[PDB]
Amino acid sequence: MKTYDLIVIGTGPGGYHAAIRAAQLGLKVLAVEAGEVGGVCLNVGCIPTKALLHAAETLHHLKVAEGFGLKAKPELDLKKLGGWRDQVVKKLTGGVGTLLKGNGVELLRGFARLVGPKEVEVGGERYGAKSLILATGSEPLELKGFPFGEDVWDSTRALKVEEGLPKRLLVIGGGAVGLELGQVYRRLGAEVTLIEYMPEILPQGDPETAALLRRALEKEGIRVRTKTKAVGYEKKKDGLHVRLEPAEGGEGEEVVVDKVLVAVGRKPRTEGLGLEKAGVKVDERGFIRVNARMETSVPGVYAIGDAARPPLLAHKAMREGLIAAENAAGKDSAFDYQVPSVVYTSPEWAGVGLTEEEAKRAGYKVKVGKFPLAASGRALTLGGAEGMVKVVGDEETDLLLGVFIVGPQAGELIAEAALALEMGATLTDLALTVHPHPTLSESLMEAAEAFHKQAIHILN
């Protein structure tokens, strides 16, 4: 049995961050990976999806561009697009491999399973360490009545646009994955229908900005059906006849499509991992129970990322990996941070902090400030202003509580909001910062001014 200071199972965002940070702190690390280095985000998630979205937005904007004299007869080669997507993925996963090697981390390819609290079995061989970090991630959640197959795709299959685009696609799930892939397919020419069980898409996010995103997608032809669920389907020669019903059940309604993309969630990869042999507690949902130090019920064993707890986001997994690594190295670290969320559709949607309802539930005297991109000079110079910024704060203390953005570059602008929350910023602090003009970032400053009823570019 080979021994190390730390064994990390999984090399996705969380796992490779843990391995590298642990190595920087002087630990001898072994990283085990059953598939491609880089995990879901780099191979079949964040990266390939953002790549497709960029190509789709570039194509889409050309229609807007006709407005300023740019006439074009764009021809998109899907095979070439798929090739570029693959190249981007390869460059990034290769880069992580080079990073692991350069940091002295040993990389073992195989499926790891615990056989004890501090012993892992891989390919019949045993490996041990005083610390273990479980970063096994998640997988597409299956939906009753829609088993994955040739006609029912998961997000991974949906990425392969070069394998034939369906004329009609039904997307089940109004979360980031469904919205993003849905828009990609629409912009590539497919008829797209998206259904969401909740009253509004992005159910956990601010309903107002989420609604604006839905409206933008509807304007592009995507049929969005909220408070709706898909019960099952029947395969016929003319396509898949899917039965739709109201959220709480009711009168049936049929929709016929060629393919179905199921994006209703993720399932943590914690079964068949040997956790029951190590004493690691798992909750009813399959998530490994952890505290703020990312430590499990077993001393010296940590869990991070999608396998540990929602939200299922990459930057969160990355930070959790650093925390677990630092603690495995003997430090005293803990996760207590504001986690932003972004949807990379066009316009983008981003949020961080508390929604109006959550702030109210928390006991704050909620007050909001809004700034429409229709009043943004920068948005106009970019060919059109679609979106808004909403700031949530306490009117008594002036404390900033949350920020929600819908529009171009929302994902880049939300970092300013995250920093503001981490610094305990007030709405006055946000308004007092001199944002450059003209920029989309200015909308945050103006939304803060609107909160105080003194915005300049809009009547208060």
Next chain:
Amino acid sequence: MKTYDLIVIGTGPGGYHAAIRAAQLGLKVLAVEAGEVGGVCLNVGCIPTKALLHAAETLHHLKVAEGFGLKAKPELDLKKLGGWRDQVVKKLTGGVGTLLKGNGVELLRGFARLVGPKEVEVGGERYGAKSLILATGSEPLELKGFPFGEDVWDSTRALKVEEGLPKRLLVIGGGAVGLELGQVYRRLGAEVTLIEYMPEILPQGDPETAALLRRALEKEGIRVRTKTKAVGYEKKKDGLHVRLEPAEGGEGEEVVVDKVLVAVGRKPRTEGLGLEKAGVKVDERGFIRVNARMETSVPGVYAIGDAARPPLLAHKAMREGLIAAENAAGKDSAFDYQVPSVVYTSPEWAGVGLTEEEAKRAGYKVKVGKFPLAASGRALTLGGAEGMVKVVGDEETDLLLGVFIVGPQAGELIAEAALALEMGATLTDLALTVHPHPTLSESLMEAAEAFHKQAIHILN
């Protein structure tokens, strides 16, 4: 004589901000404008230039897009482009006019001249007020040997691309104006040579990131010559023969172009304004002398924006207008803010805070963190991925001192840095904020980690 609580001369960014904020505070305001409402930024500066840059970037990106299957046969109608530029300007200036009216601000069209400390003459009529706010802005600075005319353009003329593109253009000035218009013309097909008197472009900005921008421009075919000046020219049959020399004087070198764009600076519009009749002191350069409250040598008379002092930026003028208005309303406000600066070229350049040299002179123990966009996953998904983020801080206290960025969306990312500085953030604070992945904003977080020698995506 008609009397008001406040008279604002000029309706550019500074002027209309002062007029509106004063109105919000209950003052009876009169705003005087000799030309188009909205000033330089909205009519012949920020807005039209950013619009042209966006069109040029959309066209340019098609080359990179070919890399992912996007085939196109672009055709740019310059007349249509100019028409769009005009539409954007008209919508925004019309918007400011609507805001002034909506706020109860009286708008008088004409050229105002003070005739006394608190009295202004317009069109032969007299107007008075307890407070006066001077926001007359600036105009293109003329260069010895290059009087403006048919062959020597100022930025306003350069905006009119629909009036014929020159085969060869010489741009004098390596500031934001020269760089931006130079890139617009190059992307539109012109041969472009740009010269800068100082050793590096963007002389007051971080030289490291400024040099990367220069190199990016040179890669696009723009010939950039620093430490160089233009002495004069002679109009011949084959074009304009311009004599160049080392900035400090020396052997001459001739360059032949069809048109020259002079972008060497601005001159404050303070002559013929009646300041000598009111007792308002002006410095050697023509700027109205003001303190942090934006107060001039005459109680009750304030000056803001380009007419008051450099840097000559829109967001600065806007904030100064708010300060002046608030003080005119009886409050106690003062300008003590970090002012970011942005160049909207591709890649963009942005900076805020202290450069390494300025921090060193300030007495800080300078330490820096750098992160290359070549290591950014998001940058790769957007195609080209060139640029870098540099953070400047104090080693002993960990205090963030300055941030400089060169790359896509640099101007949108700098607001986070500005907020950080206003909040007294340390490099640790910046690194601890969980930035969304994958985003370009992550580069700031990673540059902070690099400062501490523990960045994950690059070897330290």
